[PDB]
Amino acid sequence: LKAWHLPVAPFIKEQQERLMITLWLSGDDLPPRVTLRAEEDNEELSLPMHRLRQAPHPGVVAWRGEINLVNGQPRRRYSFKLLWADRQLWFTPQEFNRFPPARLEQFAVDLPDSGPQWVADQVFYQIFPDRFARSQSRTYYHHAAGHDIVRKAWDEPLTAEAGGSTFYGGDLDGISEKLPYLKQLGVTALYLNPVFVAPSVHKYDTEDYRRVDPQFGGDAALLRLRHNTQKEGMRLILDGVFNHSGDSHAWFDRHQRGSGGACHNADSPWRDWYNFHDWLGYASLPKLDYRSSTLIDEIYGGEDSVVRHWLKAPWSMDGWRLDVVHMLGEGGGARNNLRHIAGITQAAKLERPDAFVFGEHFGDARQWLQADVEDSAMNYRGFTFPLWGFLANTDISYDPQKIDAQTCMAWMDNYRAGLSHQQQLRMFNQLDSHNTARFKSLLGKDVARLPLAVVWLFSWPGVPCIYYGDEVGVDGNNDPFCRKPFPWDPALQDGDLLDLYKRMSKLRKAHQALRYGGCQVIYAEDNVVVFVRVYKQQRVLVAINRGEACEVVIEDSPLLDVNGWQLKEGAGALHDGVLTLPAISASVWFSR
Amino acid sequence: LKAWHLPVAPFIKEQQERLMITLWLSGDDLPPRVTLRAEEDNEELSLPMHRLRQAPHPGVVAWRGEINLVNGQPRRRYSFKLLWADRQLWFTPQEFNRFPPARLEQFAVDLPDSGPQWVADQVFYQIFPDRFARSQSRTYYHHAAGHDIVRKAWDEPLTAEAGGSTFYGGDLDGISEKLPYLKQLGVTALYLNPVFVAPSVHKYDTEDYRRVDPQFGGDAALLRLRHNTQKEGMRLILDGVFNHSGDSHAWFDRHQRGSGGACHNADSPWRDWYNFHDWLGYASLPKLDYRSSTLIDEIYGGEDSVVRHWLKAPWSMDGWRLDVVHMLGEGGGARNNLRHIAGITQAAKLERPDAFVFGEHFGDARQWLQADVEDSAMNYRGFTFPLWGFLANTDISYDPQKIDAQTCMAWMDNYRAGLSHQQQLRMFNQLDSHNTARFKSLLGKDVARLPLAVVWLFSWPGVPCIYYGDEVGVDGNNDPFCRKPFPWDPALQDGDLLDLYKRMSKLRKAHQALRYGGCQVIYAEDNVVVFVRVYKQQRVLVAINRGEACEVVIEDSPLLDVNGWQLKEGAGALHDGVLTLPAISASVWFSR
């Protein structure tokens, strides 16, 4: 028995106020009945399906039913109940199921889709401002550190000493001046590490949420960057650090810069915004207690709360990346975390309907996402760590990892199963960031697998994000060594890798299936993954081989039943259902 | 490689402000390291484990770590990360996992447990009042029906005609007078179908939430029932119907009994409590719109809201069973359903800390339960439907079902995995109710399997509930035929089945493991399920065989490493790791 369904055309079709669902079957003992199990206001429905007279592909039977769109919540969950005289069988995002699937792991499609529909069209670039680029025009005491800040020149090797107080001096006009490079790279969107006033070099120790830090060029340099990105048709996302403030913030004020700080005044106007508690034992980052209704008003509840402030004119940012999104809450811990993250997102959409709000989740984010308290997550669990395992033999803890393609794809498809198709397309996929080792370093001896990850990064459902300098081969161990200054000297740049990034953003820009398509894994065994993106009549086929050269047979699939295959990247070759794959390669084909 | 862990003594032990966790391993290639992966405020922790010098059982290595209880939310989630030089492996509630388990399918234990700790000690009995018993002392027009109500005598066969308007005349004093029978049966707790003023016989079409219906004996008969249950040390749960009112309710008033009803007055004081919408097309049950802040105040927000009213003196009920818990919400559908169900539960605990609030869930309730918006669910997905499938070859839709023991237990263990141990113990398990066919009828030709379900009902983690008359062999198809009058004539009673129920409540009352224990499935193949309940040093072993007689080998398990086994029910025999099981039997052993 075989089945196929993806939550996208040609399997679904919205028509007037109905959602038509089509299922494909093939095999020797087909169910005489099939029920469309679909949810309407959490109530499970048994919707009849009827056989289509016309076979869509050789040897394949189509069944068709409809969901009524006039009622029910926007998220349409559904799966397929196959019925014989004596037994049943479920068809799900995770293949066949002998017992009923989890309600929250069915196919799902958001109609109407109220999410940020622009995210799927983007290519994101993450910038640690101090380390990217100095503008052409181009010291104090760090109280949380034990010393004055250190200023190095752009060519000085990074060291472990005073990592959080060493400034190489990149700024926001330097990003503006580098916009032509980013457009050449294919970037359409920037995510910036924190830029607000804060004594550290990374600036997650926020002192003033209302003012850009002078060291990066100040308010005027951020306004300019907003003007220039808008002019280049580029999106801008700022780092939203709301779980905790900095201890030099006027609200807390460990160092007595004022007289009303909460750290040294039981009568402080902000005494209740704190607990007398931080972010895992770090005295420079006192945690904010969202039990206080005035704190809620200051961060998101109020009209000029911080979340909304940087979203309305003149700042008009396109959204927020939420630092430590999972621990934010009341009473010193995560109590009522979900409610508050929803509040933040809700306030953002109030100020800007298409605001993109996504959270940093190193863990399993499905509960946040499955309750719509945010649009997306930095997809470490659904994308990054599977690749660290399959390609790099390691994980978040730098514990060894021995997973084959079956496990890797079970892992990846299991995670997506909890997500609607619209959610899957705007998941924030990346290979590393300011918080991790450079993926290139993590490969160790298998660094030649790095182009494979780059191709995968652009073809797996979700929006891709480059950590600055990945494109030119920057490496380094974890924080502080993953924040090397960007090498603008092309002699210190991997030009081939740079061109791979450039072409992948071109493929993605060229082909709707890489931006809007469903995704069906087609072969996953040992060293070889093969999946296809699928959208209307177009198909994009992707074949990844992490090991020695090999040949792999590809059974006839009605998904792969096209005119022909145009090779667009990589050295693989497909002929008569035979994939010839060179060692350590990735290939992409379009359908003709 | 083998592993064992249950979220209960002897594997866990609370000590000062630490939660000690012990893992058992056995095999040829044991990991030299094991990490306790445990969550603290959603942040994943890697807690070292250390090998215990003393082997707990032959051939078995124990690892021990600790969770710090002083911080973090009350629900302590955790799993086990096994580490070799080159690879890792996860040990979970669902066995080994090659990729990381879902955060919400780890082991979990609520410390402190703020739930209703009495629920686990209970045996529940569900009564459809009109059909249970008439008190010794012992017609109008039904506007939603098309006719006057019909009154039949206790011996008249039930018919499909006017099912919702036919009254056999049972009342609440009749329950009071039958308390000795229920105590003899082993019942400690009653769940009553709706009793408030309503024209129908089932009374889910509520007309007045503040008054008991005269037909059942009125307010005074419910007060008496509250007095008598309290006197007998029995708990009382009323049916909470808050998704919708009745169309004869003063708020709606389809039949113009007043002048300010919302049905025929745009200016009605309750116009916004409705939508101009019901419960799936039924005109007698107009759905309540929880967008209205005054409605929220009337049902649960206010001090004398309905939810709280029947919980404070003189009514002092022990909680609420929530009818249609999954569809309640705003704007005519389920919008913001989770928030409102939490509000209901929250208001209940405000009035009574140990209030039991659980919802009728015919579907997958894990999202409600995993966010603590209710204490428990009528466990159709985790208990009832697995047994309808494995034992009765059918399901909610009366579609055929061909599942073996492997699938049945995968199904049951998968569902529990999403639930903490405390949640699992108070899940509301039953075999049928007013909304379903009688389980006895559902067995068709395999009715001899019925004692198997009864034993299972009392030994699977969760609180068991008898639908009135199941104990004496009542059968019948679905509504209206599942509401036969109870046969008090012992000549029309299955006395053997009655005695099976009586002994099972005795076993459960006798043995802590049947009320507080973990549960490990030990063998599950074809016709045979074998699981053990586990608590401190005691073990209760349960062996179910739905088919012909057979023998089954039971590998040595350190869980089954006890002095000896005392057979307490059934005709099975265990000797030298050999289970001899008679056809269509269930057996229970205690450890000596």
mmCIF file of N, CA and C in Angstrom, chain A residues 457-548:
data_model
loop_
_atom_site.group_PDB
_atom_site.id
_atom_site.type_symbol
_atom_site.label_atom_id
_atom_site.label_comp_id
_atom_site.label_asym_id
_atom_site.label_seq_id
_atom_site.Cartn_x
_atom_site.Cartn_y
_atom_site.Cartn_z
ATOM 1 N N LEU A 457 20.321 24.177 3.719
ATOM 2 C CA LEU A 457 19.807 25.354 4.401
ATOM 3 C C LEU A 457 18.839 26.134 3.524
ATOM 4 N N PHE A 458 19.048 26.126 2.204
ATOM 5 C CA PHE A 458 18.201 26.895 1.298
ATOM 6 C C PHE A 458 17.033 26.102 0.721
ATOM 7 N N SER A 459 16.998 24.775 0.889
ATOM 8 C CA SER A 459 15.963 23.969 0.245
ATOM 9 C C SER A 459 14.979 23.299 1.204
ATOM 10 N N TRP A 460 15.316 23.194 2.491
ATOM 11 C CA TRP A 460 14.403 22.649 3.483
ATOM 12 C C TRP A 460 13.366 23.706 3.847
ATOM 13 N N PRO A 461 12.093 23.330 3.927
ATOM 14 C CA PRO A 461 11.046 24.306 4.260
ATOM 15 C C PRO A 461 11.432 25.159 5.458
ATOM 16 N N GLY A 462 11.166 26.453 5.348
ATOM 17 C CA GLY A 462 11.640 27.423 6.310
ATOM 18 C C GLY A 462 12.468 28.499 5.631
ATOM 19 N N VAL A 463 12.686 29.569 6.383
ATOM 20 C CA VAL A 463 13.404 30.740 5.888
ATOM 21 C C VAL A 463 14.853 30.626 6.340
ATOM 22 N N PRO A 464 15.824 30.796 5.451
ATOM 23 C CA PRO A 464 17.219 30.570 5.834
ATOM 24 C C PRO A 464 17.899 31.834 6.338
ATOM 25 N N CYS A 465 18.863 31.635 7.231
ATOM 26 C CA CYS A 465 19.580 32.737 7.858
ATOM 27 C C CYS A 465 21.065 32.425 7.832
ATOM 28 N N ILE A 466 21.837 33.351 7.300
ATOM 29 C CA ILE A 466 23.290 33.286 7.310
ATOM 30 C C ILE A 466 23.789 34.032 8.538
ATOM 31 N N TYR A 467 24.637 33.388 9.318
ATOM 32 C CA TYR A 467 25.378 34.097 10.351
ATOM 33 C C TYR A 467 26.567 34.784 9.679
ATOM 34 N N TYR A 468 26.715 36.096 9.916
ATOM 35 C CA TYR A 468 27.649 36.919 9.128
ATOM 36 C C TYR A 468 29.012 36.249 9.014
ATOM 37 N N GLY A 469 29.530 36.161 7.788
ATOM 38 C CA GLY A 469 30.839 35.598 7.574
ATOM 39 C C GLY A 469 30.869 34.107 7.335
ATOM 40 N N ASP A 470 29.792 33.386 7.678
ATOM 41 C CA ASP A 470 29.670 32.006 7.222
ATOM 42 C C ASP A 470 29.896 31.917 5.714
ATOM 43 N N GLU A 471 29.356 32.875 4.961
ATOM 44 C CA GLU A 471 29.422 32.798 3.503
ATOM 45 C C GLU A 471 30.852 32.842 2.976
ATOM 46 N N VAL A 472 31.795 33.393 3.732
ATOM 47 C CA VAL A 472 33.174 33.478 3.260
ATOM 48 C C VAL A 472 34.094 32.578 4.077
ATOM 49 N N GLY A 473 33.524 31.633 4.815
ATOM 50 C CA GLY A 473 34.314 30.597 5.442
ATOM 51 C C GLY A 473 34.877 30.928 6.800
ATOM 52 N N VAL A 474 34.323 31.923 7.494
ATOM 53 C CA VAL A 474 34.749 32.188 8.860
ATOM 54 C C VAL A 474 34.518 30.958 9.726
ATOM 55 N N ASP A 475 35.499 30.628 10.574
ATOM 56 C CA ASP A 475 35.299 29.602 11.586
ATOM 57 C C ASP A 475 35.619 30.139 12.984
ATOM 58 N N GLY A 476 35.676 29.233 13.946
ATOM 59 C CA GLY A 476 35.855 29.598 15.340
ATOM 60 C C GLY A 476 35.005 28.768 16.280
ATOM 61 N N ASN A 477 35.523 28.557 17.490
ATOM 62 C CA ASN A 477 34.799 27.818 18.516
ATOM 63 C C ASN A 477 33.717 28.716 19.103
ATOM 64 N N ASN A 478 33.063 28.253 20.163
ATOM 65 C CA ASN A 478 31.935 29.001 20.688
ATOM 66 C C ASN A 478 32.405 30.314 21.309
ATOM 67 N N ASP A 479 31.430 31.200 21.546
ATOM 68 C CA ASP A 479 31.522 32.476 22.246
ATOM 69 C C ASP A 479 32.674 32.456 23.250
ATOM 70 N N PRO A 480 33.700 33.317 23.087
ATOM 71 C CA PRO A 480 33.798 34.502 22.226
ATOM 72 C C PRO A 480 34.327 34.254 20.810
ATOM 73 N N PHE A 481 34.787 33.034 20.503
ATOM 74 C CA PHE A 481 35.545 32.785 19.281
ATOM 75 C C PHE A 481 34.675 32.645 18.035
ATOM 76 N N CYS A 482 33.356 32.592 18.182
ATOM 77 C CA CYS A 482 32.443 32.591 17.047
ATOM 78 C C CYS A 482 32.073 33.999 16.592
ATOM 79 N N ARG A 483 32.742 35.019 17.125
ATOM 80 C CA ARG A 483 32.467 36.405 16.767
ATOM 81 C C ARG A 483 33.675 37.085 16.129
ATOM 82 N N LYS A 484 34.488 36.329 15.378
ATOM 83 C CA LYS A 484 35.624 36.899 14.653
ATOM 84 C C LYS A 484 35.201 38.107 13.827
ATOM 85 N N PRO A 485 36.076 39.100 13.655
ATOM 86 C CA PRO A 485 35.777 40.179 12.707
ATOM 87 C C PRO A 485 35.669 39.636 11.293
ATOM 88 N N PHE A 486 34.703 40.162 10.550
ATOM 89 C CA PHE A 486 34.493 39.745 9.169
ATOM 90 C C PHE A 486 35.727 40.068 8.330
ATOM 91 N N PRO A 487 36.215 39.129 7.508
ATOM 92 C CA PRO A 487 37.362 39.422 6.629
ATOM 93 C C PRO A 487 36.963 40.011 5.291
ATOM 94 N N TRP A 488 37.144 41.319 5.145
ATOM 95 C CA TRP A 488 36.840 41.980 3.881
ATOM 96 C C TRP A 488 37.946 41.826 2.856
ATOM 97 N N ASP A 489 39.131 41.420 3.287
ATOM 98 C CA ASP A 489 40.232 41.075 2.396
ATOM 99 C C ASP A 489 39.894 39.791 1.653
ATOM 100 N N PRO A 490 39.552 39.851 0.367
ATOM 101 C CA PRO A 490 39.142 38.632 -0.346
ATOM 102 C C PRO A 490 40.191 37.547 -0.313
ATOM 103 N N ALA A 491 41.447 37.911 -0.051
ATOM 104 C CA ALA A 491 42.498 36.914 0.075
ATOM 105 C C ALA A 491 42.276 36.026 1.278
ATOM 106 N N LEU A 492 41.520 36.501 2.264
ATOM 107 C CA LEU A 492 41.132 35.693 3.415
ATOM 108 C C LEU A 492 39.679 35.220 3.335
ATOM 109 N N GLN A 493 39.136 35.079 2.120
ATOM 110 C CA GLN A 493 37.758 34.664 1.884
ATOM 111 C C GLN A 493 37.736 33.402 1.037
ATOM 112 N N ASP A 494 36.832 32.481 1.383
ATOM 113 C CA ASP A 494 36.568 31.292 0.574
ATOM 114 C C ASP A 494 35.623 31.701 -0.552
ATOM 115 N N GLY A 495 36.190 32.011 -1.719
ATOM 116 C CA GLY A 495 35.376 32.543 -2.802
ATOM 117 C C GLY A 495 34.417 31.531 -3.395
ATOM 118 N N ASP A 496 34.802 30.256 -3.416
ATOM 119 C CA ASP A 496 33.896 29.219 -3.902
ATOM 120 C C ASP A 496 32.669 29.110 -3.007
ATOM 121 N N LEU A 497 32.883 29.017 -1.693
ATOM 122 C CA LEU A 497 31.749 28.944 -0.777
ATOM 123 C C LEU A 497 30.859 30.168 -0.934
ATOM 124 N N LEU A 498 31.468 31.348 -1.074
ATOM 125 C CA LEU A 498 30.686 32.556 -1.303
ATOM 126 C C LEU A 498 29.775 32.401 -2.513
ATOM 127 N N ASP A 499 30.285 31.798 -3.592
ATOM 128 C CA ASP A 499 29.493 31.666 -4.811
ATOM 129 C C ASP A 499 28.391 30.620 -4.667
ATOM 130 N N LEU A 500 28.623 29.584 -3.852
ATOM 131 C CA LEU A 500 27.568 28.614 -3.554
ATOM 132 C C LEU A 500 26.370 29.287 -2.885
ATOM 133 N N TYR A 501 26.626 30.078 -1.838
ATOM 134 C CA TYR A 501 25.571 30.879 -1.227
ATOM 135 C C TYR A 501 24.849 31.724 -2.266
ATOM 136 N N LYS A 502 25.609 32.394 -3.148
ATOM 137 C CA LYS A 502 24.988 33.291 -4.120
ATOM 138 C C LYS A 502 24.047 32.538 -5.050
ATOM 139 N N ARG A 503 24.485 31.396 -5.570
ATOM 140 C CA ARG A 503 23.617 30.622 -6.453
ATOM 141 C C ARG A 503 22.395 30.060 -5.712
ATOM 142 N N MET A 504 22.559 29.604 -4.460
ATOM 143 C CA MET A 504 21.402 29.047 -3.748
ATOM 144 C C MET A 504 20.335 30.104 -3.525
ATOM 145 N N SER A 505 20.736 31.318 -3.156
ATOM 146 C CA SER A 505 19.722 32.356 -3.060
ATOM 147 C C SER A 505 19.095 32.622 -4.423
ATOM 148 N N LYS A 506 19.839 32.383 -5.510
ATOM 149 C CA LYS A 506 19.268 32.545 -6.848
ATOM 150 C C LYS A 506 18.238 31.461 -7.145
ATOM 151 N N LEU A 507 18.600 30.186 -6.945
ATOM 152 C CA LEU A 507 17.618 29.098 -7.051
ATOM 153 C C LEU A 507 16.358 29.389 -6.242
ATOM 154 N N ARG A 508 16.521 29.779 -4.976
ATOM 155 C CA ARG A 508 15.360 30.016 -4.120
ATOM 156 C C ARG A 508 14.515 31.165 -4.645
ATOM 157 N N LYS A 509 15.163 32.267 -5.031
ATOM 158 C CA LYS A 509 14.462 33.379 -5.672
ATOM 159 C C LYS A 509 13.776 32.938 -6.960
ATOM 160 N N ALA A 510 14.351 31.961 -7.662
ATOM 161 C CA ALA A 510 13.820 31.594 -8.972
ATOM 162 C C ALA A 510 12.570 30.719 -8.874
ATOM 163 N N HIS A 511 12.491 29.836 -7.876
ATOM 164 C CA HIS A 511 11.556 28.717 -7.917
ATOM 165 C C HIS A 511 10.596 28.755 -6.738
ATOM 166 N N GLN A 512 9.299 28.899 -7.036
ATOM 167 C CA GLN A 512 8.266 28.976 -6.004
ATOM 168 C C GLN A 512 8.314 27.798 -5.021
ATOM 169 N N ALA A 513 8.718 26.607 -5.479
ATOM 170 C CA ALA A 513 8.629 25.430 -4.614
ATOM 171 C C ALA A 513 9.595 25.509 -3.433
ATOM 172 N N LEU A 514 10.701 26.249 -3.591
ATOM 173 C CA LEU A 514 11.675 26.466 -2.528
ATOM 174 C C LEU A 514 11.216 27.501 -1.527
ATOM 175 N N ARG A 515 10.114 28.162 -1.792
ATOM 176 C CA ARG A 515 9.609 29.172 -0.887
ATOM 177 C C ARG A 515 8.230 28.838 -0.351
ATOM 178 N N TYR A 516 7.375 28.207 -1.165
ATOM 179 C CA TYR A 516 5.997 27.928 -0.786
ATOM 180 C C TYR A 516 5.660 26.446 -0.785
ATOM 181 N N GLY A 517 6.593 25.588 -1.171
ATOM 182 C CA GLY A 517 6.252 24.222 -1.467
ATOM 183 C C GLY A 517 6.126 23.337 -0.238
ATOM 184 N N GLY A 518 5.330 22.280 -0.393
ATOM 185 C CA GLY A 518 5.407 21.161 0.521
ATOM 186 C C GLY A 518 6.748 20.468 0.383
ATOM 187 N N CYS A 519 6.964 19.502 1.265
ATOM 188 C CA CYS A 519 8.220 18.768 1.283
ATOM 189 C C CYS A 519 7.934 17.309 1.587
ATOM 190 N N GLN A 520 8.374 16.422 0.696
ATOM 191 C CA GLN A 520 8.270 14.980 0.881
ATOM 192 C C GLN A 520 9.660 14.370 0.814
ATOM 193 N N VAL A 521 10.098 13.778 1.925
ATOM 194 C CA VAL A 521 11.307 12.967 1.909
ATOM 195 C C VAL A 521 11.020 11.721 1.096
ATOM 196 N N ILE A 522 11.950 11.364 0.219
ATOM 197 C CA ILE A 522 11.719 10.335 -0.773
ATOM 198 C C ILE A 522 12.621 9.134 -0.567
ATOM 199 N N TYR A 523 13.802 9.336 0.005
ATOM 200 C CA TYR A 523 14.775 8.281 0.253
ATOM 201 C C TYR A 523 15.642 8.796 1.376
ATOM 202 N N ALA A 524 15.870 7.972 2.393
ATOM 203 C CA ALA A 524 16.685 8.390 3.530
ATOM 204 C C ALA A 524 17.290 7.126 4.124
ATOM 205 N N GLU A 525 18.570 6.910 3.858
ATOM 206 C CA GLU A 525 19.217 5.684 4.290
ATOM 207 C C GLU A 525 20.719 5.911 4.354
ATOM 208 N N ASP A 526 21.319 5.520 5.476
ATOM 209 C CA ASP A 526 22.753 5.650 5.700
ATOM 210 C C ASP A 526 23.246 7.063 5.394
ATOM 211 N N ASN A 527 23.999 7.228 4.301
ATOM 212 C CA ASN A 527 24.605 8.511 3.962
ATOM 213 C C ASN A 527 23.745 9.394 3.074
ATOM 214 N N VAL A 528 22.603 8.915 2.592
ATOM 215 C CA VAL A 528 21.884 9.579 1.511
ATOM 216 C C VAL A 528 20.491 10.014 1.966
ATOM 217 N N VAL A 529 20.209 11.306 1.822
ATOM 218 C CA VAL A 529 18.879 11.881 1.958
ATOM 219 C C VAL A 529 18.456 12.357 0.576
ATOM 220 N N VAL A 530 17.193 12.127 0.221
ATOM 221 C CA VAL A 530 16.616 12.640 -1.023
ATOM 222 C C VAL A 530 15.205 13.118 -0.716
ATOM 223 N N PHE A 531 14.956 14.415 -0.880
ATOM 224 C CA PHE A 531 13.617 14.960 -0.745
ATOM 225 C C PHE A 531 13.273 15.841 -1.932
ATOM 226 N N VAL A 532 11.979 16.087 -2.079
ATOM 227 C CA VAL A 532 11.459 16.892 -3.167
ATOM 228 C C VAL A 532 10.595 17.988 -2.570
ATOM 229 N N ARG A 533 10.798 19.220 -3.019
ATOM 230 C CA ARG A 533 9.837 20.274 -2.749
ATOM 231 C C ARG A 533 8.801 20.237 -3.858
ATOM 232 N N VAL A 534 7.561 20.582 -3.522
ATOM 233 C CA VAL A 534 6.419 20.314 -4.390
ATOM 234 C C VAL A 534 5.478 21.506 -4.334
ATOM 235 N N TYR A 535 5.144 22.063 -5.493
ATOM 236 C CA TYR A 535 4.251 23.213 -5.517
ATOM 237 C C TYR A 535 3.616 23.348 -6.893
ATOM 238 N N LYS A 536 2.282 23.428 -6.913
ATOM 239 C CA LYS A 536 1.494 23.261 -8.125
ATOM 240 C C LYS A 536 2.139 22.175 -8.976
ATOM 241 N N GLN A 537 2.475 22.500 -10.221
ATOM 242 C CA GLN A 537 3.060 21.534 -11.136
ATOM 243 C C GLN A 537 4.579 21.441 -11.038
ATOM 244 N N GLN A 538 5.236 22.364 -10.342
ATOM 245 C CA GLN A 538 6.693 22.389 -10.275
ATOM 246 C C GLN A 538 7.207 21.474 -9.168
ATOM 247 N N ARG A 539 8.391 20.899 -9.385
ATOM 248 C CA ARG A 539 9.043 20.037 -8.406
ATOM 249 C C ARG A 539 10.523 20.384 -8.346
ATOM 250 N N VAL A 540 11.069 20.519 -7.142
ATOM 251 C CA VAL A 540 12.496 20.719 -6.961
ATOM 252 C C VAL A 540 13.026 19.528 -6.195
ATOM 253 N N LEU A 541 13.995 18.834 -6.773
ATOM 254 C CA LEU A 541 14.506 17.597 -6.205
ATOM 255 C C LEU A 541 15.897 17.825 -5.631
ATOM 256 N N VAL A 542 16.145 17.303 -4.431
ATOM 257 C CA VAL A 542 17.375 17.573 -3.688
ATOM 258 C C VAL A 542 17.946 16.264 -3.162
ATOM 259 N N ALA A 543 19.217 16.019 -3.448
ATOM 260 C CA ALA A 543 19.876 14.759 -3.129
ATOM 261 C C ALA A 543 21.165 15.062 -2.395
ATOM 262 N N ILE A 544 21.280 14.581 -1.161
ATOM 263 C CA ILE A 544 22.433 14.864 -0.316
ATOM 264 C C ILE A 544 23.120 13.557 0.024
ATOM 265 N N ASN A 545 24.434 13.518 -0.183
ATOM 266 C CA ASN A 545 25.252 12.349 0.119
ATOM 267 C C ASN A 545 26.446 12.803 0.946
ATOM 268 N N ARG A 546 26.501 12.377 2.200
ATOM 269 C CA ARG A 546 27.569 12.788 3.103
ATOM 270 C C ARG A 546 28.786 11.883 3.042
ATOM 271 N N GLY A 547 28.750 10.827 2.242
ATOM 272 C CA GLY A 547 29.845 9.875 2.266
ATOM 273 C C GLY A 547 30.443 9.620 0.902
ATOM 274 N N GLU A 548 31.159 8.505 0.760
ATOM 275 C CA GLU A 548 31.774 8.090 -0.498
ATOM 276 C C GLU A 548 30.772 8.079 -1.646
#
